[PDB]
């Protein structure tokens, strides 16, 4: 078997003649998030593109931070709208990125400011 | 002098980002071979150099999208009332019905556009966040005019904002306040026509995706080349031959693959430079044309500029420039100044015209004939010096009340 | 990185020319000399290409900075967000090591107030439109103010200009227009 990329992907077993698909196994990279050696030593390690306190993200697999329902401006980016920061004793936390603060203008037919 | 006008809307597409990629040099060059990695250790630091270049490209690509859209620091909300003095913004405003907070034009645009050591990193900003930015900018433009571009937003009725906008190009407010329904109908019809036109175009956004795919495919295909060696597969070279002789083949393979990787990274960096330039231009357009009227000719669309509504597209931004264009003109006879009592009377703001039997003064862009008066004109110079002068009487408002 | 590139053997015997020259005879010397030369040449080519691209980007930034110095400093700029944030008044250049620093002096409104406005005024069956200001009402009277800074004035025939009729417009209200000629009739 082959793909458009000219690499073997499908192999038929000669012994009993069924079809087997070959997929590359567990390939990615490691990344470490730190808040600076001048303040603390705790770090959080992120494996990207790998399906695994373990929190699952759309950017991979992140270990060392816990999810929070709260929202903050981004400090240390991760990917796919996820960010981390040291400030909460103090542990690394991952929060969904938030954009600005909600505000609604009072627009009427005959009102000006 | 023009006597009628039509409103038209034209699109503009500017790419702002390209796919962020990274490559594991050891996996690409040598695969899972043990001796190949040992032999590859001779060169050194090439992998670090390549990875640094790729990472710099990726962070620049993220920063471009961060810069182009994040202009406001306050998320705005569209008011529930949909009355805008006859203007129909249903097509471009966000639709809560759809599962994703994307408007009709965004949805139509998105549909229209269509593993050996290589990885693709996801963007920092998801599509929902970009759509939220776009909706906030659209609402800020609609409700607050240009005020929210500088400081706290200030609400203002849409009709008055349009009257202000004509006042920028050099036409009085009466031309709007007396022809509001016509303008609303023309704008809605133009929006609908553009919506139909986009249904069947593009080509700038499809370029970057195709180029990236072609480059990656070419690299993967180049994986299998022999590069002057006897066999492409490393496993055959290791098993079949004597270890002393296999080193020459391994060296040929690694040299060729390294050169191909260098070519790929140079091409990517060259293209990223151009993408950065285009993103800078798009950011400038976003800042100037949208957050306020633009006096620059043709910078924000052919014809006089009124406003523009940004829209989101895959790896890019699609604009909607609104322009004013004079429709129909009539021949007229003009004079520089009128001599009344030996003194010239130069017009204050308009240009003097003649029906063929009398004389009138009117604004340049729109034919609005007005009777001559001392209020509309000032006095300077003498009758002799002027190159061309016509004889006519100047009406004075003070004389009638002398009873 | 360019300097560190020296210590790589590139597949030859050693990364130093002196050791190769003394240990081997001229007939066998070239086998390592060319191996070293190819690698060093490749390193130089990579360095020069990187420098070429970085110089191009720096030149783009320098052109942008020259444009900003020409436009913001030597005259007021009407472009939005080109010269600082907000309305722009003036800017002062300052120097820095391999860079330039600007101080845009901007203008931003602070305190806004609720108001009720009408597009035009129908005084005696003839529409009235403000020349520069906008009609604003306190709830008991009507005023005209310049759009940016609040400063009420009474409507006068020298503030508005008559045009059209009372039927065509959409937004319209009734109010008397002060006539400066009337007291002059005494
Ligand atoms: C990881 O694998 C599990 C196993 O079925 C699956 O349920 C889950 O959706 C996977 N997650 C990702 C992000 O692929
Ligand atoms: C303005 O719109 C409101 C909608 O609630 C309507 O009740 C009112 O009559 C309108 N006034 C004018 C002057 O258009
Ligand atoms: C301008 O063109 C429109 C197009 O139908 C027309 O309805 C309108 O009457 C024209 N303007 C004048 C002043 O005739
Ligand atoms: C705006 O246009 C849409 C598109 O047909 C229409 O469904 C809607 O009723 C229009 N809104 C108004 C207020 O006419
Ligand atoms: C305009 O051109 C005609 C052509 O001969 C000439 O007679 C007339 O004097 C010109 N008028 C001016 C004001 O130049
Ligand atoms: C305008 O009037 C003066 C005074 O009567 C006269 O001399 C002059 O010729 C007139 N202009 C023309 C173009 O005839
Ligand atoms: C402005 O005043 C009107 C009536 O005086 C009021 O209905 C409206 O709520 C006020 N605006 C705000 C933002 O409170
Ligand atoms: C203004 O006065 C006219 C004259 O009678 C009247 O018809 C109109 O309704 C008035 N407008 C108001 C009260 O808003």
Author numbering:
A (entry chain A): 566 to 617, 641 to 676, 689 to 713
B (entry chain B): 714 to 827, 855 to 940, 944 to 1146
C (entry chain A): 961 to 1146
Report text from the authors:
The SARS-CoV-2 spike glycoprotein is the major surface antigen of the virus. Here we have examined the structures and receptor-binding properties of spikes of the B.1.1.7 variant first described in Kent, United Kingdom (now termed Alpha)10,16–19 and the B.1.351 variant first described in South Africa (now termed Beta). Recently emerging variants of SARS-CoV-2 have acquired other substitutions in the spike including a number located at the monomer-monomer interfaces, at the receptor-binding site, and near the furin-cleavage site.
Third, the most striking feature of the structure of Beta spike revealed by cryoEM is that all the trimers adopt an open conformation. Again, solution equilibria cannot be extracted from these data but we interpret this near-complete switch in states as indicative of the open form of the Beta variant being more stable than the open form of Wuhan. Inspection of the sequence of the Beta spike and comparison of its structure with that of the closed form of Wuhan spike and the open and closed forms of G614 spikes, suggests that the opening of Beta spike could be driven by the substitution K417N on the background of G614 (both also observed in the Omicron variant spike). In Wuhan, Lysine at residue 417 on the RBD not only makes an aliphatic packing interaction with Tyr-369 of the neighbouring subunit, it also forms a salt bridge/hydrogen bond network with Glu-406 and Arg-403 of the RBD and with Ser-373 of the neighbouring RBD that stabilises the closed conformation. In contrast, the substitution of an asparagine at position 417 in Beta removes an intramolecular salt bridge and would generate a steric clash with Tyr-369 of the neighbouring RBD leading to destabilisation of the closed form and thus promotion of the open form. In the same way that G614 is a prerequisite for realising tighter receptor binding by the substitution N501Y described above, it may also enable spike protein from the Beta virus to achieve an open conformation as a result of the K417N substitution. In the Beta variant spike, the presence of a new substitution, K417N (also observed in the Omicron variant), in combination with the D614G, stabilises a more open spike trimer, a conformation required for receptor binding.
